[PDB]
Design an enzyme around this catalytic site. Structure first.
Site, PDB file in Angstrom:
ATOM      1  CG  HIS A  99      -7.602  -1.078   8.144  1.00 55.12           C
ATOM      2  ND1 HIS A  99      -8.330  -0.142   7.670  1.00 55.12           N
ATOM      3  CD2 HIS A  99      -6.426  -0.474   8.531  1.00 55.12           C
ATOM      4  CE1 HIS A  99      -7.730   0.946   7.658  1.00 55.12           C
ATOM      5  NE2 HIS A  99      -6.735   0.905   8.403  1.00 55.12           N
ATOM      6  CD  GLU A 112      -2.772   1.627   2.434  1.00 58.82           C
ATOM      7  OE1 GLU A 112      -2.682   0.606   3.263  1.00 58.82           O
ATOM      8  OE2 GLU A 112      -3.604   2.428   2.270  1.00 58.82           O
ATOM      9  CG  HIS A 128      -5.599   1.311  12.672  1.00 63.46           C
ATOM     10  ND1 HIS A 128      -6.242   2.441  12.734  1.00 63.46           N
ATOM     11  CD2 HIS A 128      -5.068   1.168  11.445  1.00 63.46           C
ATOM     12  CE1 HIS A 128      -6.205   2.815  11.524  1.00 63.46           C
ATOM     13  NE2 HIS A 128      -5.440   2.216  10.723  1.00 63.46           N
ATOM     14  CD  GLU A 129      -2.583  -1.845  10.744  1.00 66.21           C
ATOM     15  OE1 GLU A 129      -3.198  -1.886   9.602  1.00 66.21           O
ATOM     16  OE2 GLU A 129      -2.370  -0.886  11.501  1.00 66.21           O
ATOM     17  CD  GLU A 170      -5.962   3.773   7.123  1.00 65.89           C
ATOM     18  OE1 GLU A 170      -5.903   4.001   8.351  1.00 65.89           O
ATOM     19  OE2 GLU A 170      -5.453   3.054   6.611  1.00 65.89           O
ATOM     20  N   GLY A 177       3.899   1.932  10.368  1.00 68.57           N
ATOM     21  CA  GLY A 177       3.456   1.396  11.667  1.00 68.57           C
ATOM     22  C   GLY A 177       2.850  -0.018  11.612  1.00 68.57           C
ATOM     23  CB  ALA A 178       0.764  -2.166  11.784  1.00 63.62           C
ATOM     24  CG  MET A 179       0.005  -3.410   4.844  1.00 62.84           C
ATOM     25  SD  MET A 179      -1.055  -2.012   4.598  1.00 62.84           S
ATOM     26  CE  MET A 179      -2.528  -2.530   3.677  1.00 62.84           C
ATOM     27  CD  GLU A 180      -4.854  -1.737   5.859  1.00 65.01           C
ATOM     28  OE1 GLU A 180      -3.863  -1.280   6.517  1.00 65.01           O
ATOM     29  OE2 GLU A 180      -5.467  -0.768   4.984  1.00 65.01           O
TER      30      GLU A 180
HETATM   31  N1  LIG Z   1      -2.927   1.209   6.032  1.00 59.71           N
HETATM   32  C1  LIG Z   1      -1.984   1.369   7.003  1.00 59.71           C
HETATM   33  C2  LIG Z   1      -0.928   2.345   6.623  1.00 59.71           C
HETATM   34  C3  LIG Z   1      -0.074   2.070   5.172  1.00 59.71           C
HETATM   35  C4  LIG Z   1       0.868   3.282   4.719  1.00 59.71           C
HETATM   36  C5  LIG Z   1       1.221   4.007   5.778  1.00 59.71           C
HETATM   37  C6  LIG Z   1       2.138   5.144   5.274  1.00 59.71           C
HETATM   38  C7  LIG Z   1       2.368   5.219   4.028  1.00 59.71           C
HETATM   39  N2  LIG Z   1       1.913   4.288   3.032  1.00 59.71           N
HETATM   40  C8  LIG Z   1       1.279   3.396   3.492  1.00 59.71           C
HETATM   41  P1  LIG Z   1      -2.613   1.774   8.546  1.00 59.71           P
HETATM   42  O1  LIG Z   1      -3.246   3.129   8.453  1.00 59.71           O
HETATM   43  O2  LIG Z   1      -3.522   0.798   8.778  1.00 59.71           O
HETATM   44  C9  LIG Z   1      -1.522   1.747   9.710  1.00 59.71           C
HETATM   45  C10 LIG Z   1      -0.807   3.308  10.176  1.00 59.71           C
HETATM   46  C11 LIG Z   1      -0.498   3.442  11.582  1.00 59.71           C
HETATM   47  C12 LIG Z   1      -1.696   3.923  12.467  1.00 59.71           C
HETATM   48  C13 LIG Z   1      -2.284   3.008  13.276  1.00 59.71           C
HETATM   49  C14 LIG Z   1      -3.400   3.416  14.202  1.00 59.71           C
HETATM   50  C15 LIG Z   1      -3.907   4.803  14.128  1.00 59.71           C
HETATM   51  C16 LIG Z   1      -3.058   5.641  13.379  1.00 59.71           C
HETATM   52  C17 LIG Z   1      -1.961   5.126  12.411  1.00 59.71           C
HETATM   53  C18 LIG Z   1       0.539   3.626   9.614  1.00 59.71           C
HETATM   54  O3  LIG Z   1       1.400   2.789   9.429  1.00 59.71           O
HETATM   55  O4  LIG Z   1       0.706   4.745   9.182  1.00 59.71           O
HETATM   56 ZN   LIG Z   2      -5.174   2.212   8.804  1.00 60.06          ZN
END
Ligand SMILES: N[C@@H](CCc1cccnc1)P(=O)(O)C[C@@H](Cc1ccccc1)C(=O)O
Ligand SMILES: [Zn+2]
Length: 864
Positions: A294, A114, A290-291, A313, A254-257
């Site tokens: 999603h 993503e 969060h993940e 988001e 931070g993480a990816m769903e």
């Molecule tokens: N879809 C993911 C971001 C991917 C991304 C991110 C940046 C650039 N390109 C792609 P995320 O939203 O679930 C995780 C959030 C962390 C988060 C988790 C909970 C609340 C707020 C943010 C993050 O990793 O940014």
């Molecule tokens: Zn997210």
């Protein structure tokens, strides 16, 4: 190349099935694809995005006539009916320092797709309104890559006599390419399960290094809590019998769903009390939630186009906030969320990169994973909840999924689900998606006869994208206090109550709160009911009354915030006039009451003793000298430190006693530690020499990382050599724990000591530092860029340093560089000397041949 929302068109082709084959070797991985393509607009060229090395292309099994141009492959001669395309690409994952697509980390292989990383793996219609059913085969040496994962269900696998093995993963849910993931490596597994409310076991597997496995337990418990919560709160059930989570130490975000196979920065999945703070534990809980959330708000229903990012988001951030709030400490966590929005999102909305929650254009989509899209996005979702109530909000959620399960949709569709499910018109609400900037409310109050008359005006400023701003739909939750700080009742829309939501829809409105028989002070914007600035003429005495007696956590805290802001303003005046500092009599009285109040929640009390950041303090100013604001804020902290010093020690003693040696993470123990650490900061500000006493008993106090971090934070600005010794001992003690070394580098970068820039330059050469690791780059350099007295040094050395590092980092990781370069966003609001130097820094970045689109887009917004 700008991308515009107005130009959206449905795709000429759909992809019904995506069959992938990964052959992992040394050093190359060869990827074969087979796409089952369904024409939508028959006869159009098939255009495939891709940037990997291309080895071959077939159409219907025959070598294809095509043309490769830039990052696109075009096949002009397309069949008029269903057909297949087969693409073969080659990747060198160990050379991939961008950490997008397929890359190496710790001897293993991971993906991040993503938003537009899948095209770095194969040639594809890499846009989220194209949803396909993926099946993924992976072949690799068994001893080197014993763990081979992709999305969905493992449906086959086997062995070869040459030591290689293979697996096949079928994900039966159509998905956009940004949700694809693959992991290959030598990882340890932690196993658990959850039984859904329909009685189905879900196998849970967390993958980590062997050494890291003992730190994954809290994340596992958090996931199980998140699964249960989505059932009880939203009625949402998981939809596979397997849920995998993989930790990776090299990760841009931070993480990816990714469906059934989440990939997490180590930071948001690994903790134990020895190495992680309470705040880290809370972070793991939030992001694991969060993940997982999603899976419905993002995966089952996805995004039509990337301009709709906040559809998943904003909503999923709302969901993770509500999950954490339901777990513990709802009011305190709500204030923490508001504080983060105002400290980080408000400056974005006031600055050169301001954008709507649903942007109308972008150059590079990676630049739009922003505070605005996420945190302001969540405030917008939360306003549906404030307008509709929990039950109505869930009616909207229910209709949203009924209508749009399996689809890629828009913010408009979510609003319509909310509107239609509740039979109300939310047309005006759409402006929360399309109008950038922070609305400003001016309010006034009079009690004439037996009616409290509250007049409210709204204005929304021009932003670089849009001058015209129309009145918005703004819920203002209110109440009344009498001179005794007691709640006063009033009549509104034929109802007698202690609280009301006033819906401001016009440029100016007067609300009549009838039947008010005694003098009142209004309580305004309760719970931070809309994401706005509100100005109301409160006396200092009014603010004390609110702080002492109001029934709403936010309005109580905001009253304190306001007294602090007024005290800093008074400091700015005297320091400017070259005279003695103010007395701050009313403020001190208020803090004294706060410190001594035994009824206050300890984490809430901690929040009441937090002073607004420099950025909050200079919000709305022109010709800013950041050092003057820093000096004024420091003077206030010095005063609070020295003035209340005996109570800081007493409070510290109480916090130690009440913690009761319960060093593991719990919200109750954590609140005592939070207060303890505020006390430590003040004690060491008042008496720097106390560090030697602290150092003598450091071992005794170092009972968990919350304590070590709290102590090192309190002394970090201390000019004693002992500060340097304690920090060196911290690095030695935790040298083998990369997440703790991140903390070390953050302390190095954030110090208010005079020598921070030279210490930072030495830290760049530390054996555990790596510029190519985003956690490390963020910890040392990111922290320095937020270090007001050093970043904004008058001699420009901070600007030159950060610009050097933007330049260096952009060569291999444009995403890290583009986040970093936003340290310069205050450019045009600076006093002329620093403004000149910041402009020179940005022009120098701009002068770099080969500068990424990522960094280029931001530099243009600032300079041009
Ligand atoms: N879809 C993911 C971001 C991917 C991304 C991110 C940046 C650039 N390109 C792609 P995320 O939203 O679930 C995780 C959030 C962390 C988060 C988790 C909970 C609340 C707020 C943010 C993050 O990793 O940014
Ligand atoms: Zn997210």
């Amino acid at each position: 190349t700008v991308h515009y929302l107005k130009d959206y068109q449905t795709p000429a082709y759909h992809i019904l099935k995506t069959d992938l084959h990964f052959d992992i070797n040394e050093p190359q991985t060869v990827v074969k694809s087979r796409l089952t393509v369904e024409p939508q607009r028959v006869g159009e060229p098939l255009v495939l995005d891709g940037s990997a090395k291309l080895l071959s292309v077939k159409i219907n099994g025959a070598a294809a006539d095509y043309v490769l141009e830039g990052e696109t492959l075009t096949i002009a001669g397309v069949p008029s009916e269903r057909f297949t395309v087969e693409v073969e690409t080659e990747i060198l994952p160990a050379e991939n320092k961008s950490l997008m697509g397929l890359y190496a980390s710790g001897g293993n292989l991971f993906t991040q797709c993503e938003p537009e990383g899948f095209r770095k793996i194969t040639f594809y219609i890499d846009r989220p309104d194209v949803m396909s059913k993926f099946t993924t085969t992976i072949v690799a040496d068994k001893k080197r890559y014993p763990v081979l994962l992709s999305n969905g269900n493992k449906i086959d696998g086997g062995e070869f006599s040459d030591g290689r093995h293979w697996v096949k993963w079928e994900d039966p849910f159509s998905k956009p390419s940004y949700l694809f993931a693959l992991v290959a490596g030598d990882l340890a597994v932690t196993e658990d399960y959850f039984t859904t409310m329909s009685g189905r076991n879900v196998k849970i597997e967390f993958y980590t290094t062997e050494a890291d496995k003992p730190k994954v337990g809290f994340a596992v418990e958090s996931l199980k809590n998140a699964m249960k919560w989505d059932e009880t709160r939203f009625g949402l059930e998981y939809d596979l019998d397997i849920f995998m989570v993989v930790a990776v130490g090299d990760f841009n975000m931070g993480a990816m769903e990714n469906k059934g196979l989440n990939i997490f920065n180590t930071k948001f999945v690994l903790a134990d009390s020895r190495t992680a703070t309470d705040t880290d534990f809370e972070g793991i809980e939030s992001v694991v939630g969060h993940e997982y959330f999603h899976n419905w708000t993002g995966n089952r229903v996805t995004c039509r186009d990337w301009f709709q990012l906040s559809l998943k988001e904003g909503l999923t951030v709302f969901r993770d906030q509500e999950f954490s709030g339901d777990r513990a400490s709802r009011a305190v966590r709500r204030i923490e969320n508001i504080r983060l929005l105002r400290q980080h999102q408000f400056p974005e909305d006031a600055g050169p990169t301001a954008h709507p929650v649903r942007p109308a254009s972008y150059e590079e989509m990676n630049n739009f994973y922003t505070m605005t899209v996420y945190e302001k996005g969540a405030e917008v979702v939360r306003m549906y909840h404030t307008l509709l109530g929990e039950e109505g909000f869930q009616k909207g959620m229910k209709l949203y999924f009924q209508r749009h399960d399996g689809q890629a949709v828009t913010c408009d569709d979510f609003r319509a689900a909310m509107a239609d499910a509740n039979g109300i018109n939310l047309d005006q609400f759409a402006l929360w998606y399309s109008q950038a900037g922070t609305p400003v409310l001016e309010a006034e109050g009079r009690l004439k006869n037996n009616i409290f008359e509250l007049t409210v005006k709204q204005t929304v400023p021009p932003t670089p994208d849009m001058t015209d701003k129309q009145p918005m739909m703004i819920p203002v939750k209110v109440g009344l206090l009498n001179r005794n700080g007691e709640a006063v009742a009033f009549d509104y829309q034929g109802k007698r109550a202690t609280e009301a939501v006033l819906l401001l829809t016009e440029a100016e409105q007067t609300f009549l709160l009838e039947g008010v028989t005694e003098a009142v002070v209004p309580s305004l914007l309760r719970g931070f009911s809309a994401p706005v600035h509100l100005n109301y003429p409160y006396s200092d005495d009014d603010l004390l009354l609110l702080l002492a007696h109001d029934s709403d956590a936010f309005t109580r805290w905001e009253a304190a915030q306001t007294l602090y802001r007024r005290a800093v303003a008074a400091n700015l005046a005297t320091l400017s006039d070259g005279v003695e500092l103010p007395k701050h009599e009313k403020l001190l009285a208020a803090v004294e009451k706060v410190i001594s109040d035994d009824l206050l929640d300890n984490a809430f009390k901690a929040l009441l003793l937090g002073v607004p950041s420099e950025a909050e303090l200079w919000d709305g100013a022109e010709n800013i000298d950041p050092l003057r604001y820093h000096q004024a804020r420091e003077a206030l902290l010095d005063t609070l430190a020295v003035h209340f010093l005996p109570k800081w020690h007493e409070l510290n003693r109480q916090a130690a006693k009440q913690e009761n040696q319960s060093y593991e993470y719990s919200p109750e123990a954590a609140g005592w530690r939070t207060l303890r650490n505020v006390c430590r900061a003040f004690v060491l500000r008042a008496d720097p020499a106390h560090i030697e006493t602290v150092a003598e008993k450091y071992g005794e106090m170092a009972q968990n990382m919350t304590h070590e971090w709290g102590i090192l934070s309190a002394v970090n600005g201390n000019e004693s050599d002992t500060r340097n010794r304690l920090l060196a001992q911290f690095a030695d003690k935790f040298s083998d724990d990369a997440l703790v070394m991140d903390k070390y580098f953050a302390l190095v970068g954030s110090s208010r000591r005079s020598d921070t820039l030279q210490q930072v330059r030495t830290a760049l050469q530390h054996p555990k530092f790596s510029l190519e690791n985003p956690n490390k780059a963020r910890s040392l350099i990111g922290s320095f860029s937020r270090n007001v007295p050093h970043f904004h040094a008058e001699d420009g050395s901070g600007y030159r340093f950060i610009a050097d590092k933007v330049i260096e980092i952009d060569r291999f990781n444009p995403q890290v560089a583009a986040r970093l370069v936003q340290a310069f966003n205050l450019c045009n609001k600076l006093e002329p000397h620093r403004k000149n130097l910041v402009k020179q820094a940005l022009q120098r970045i701009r002068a770099q041949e080969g500068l990424s689109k990522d960094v280029g887009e931001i530099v243009g917004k600032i300079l041009d």
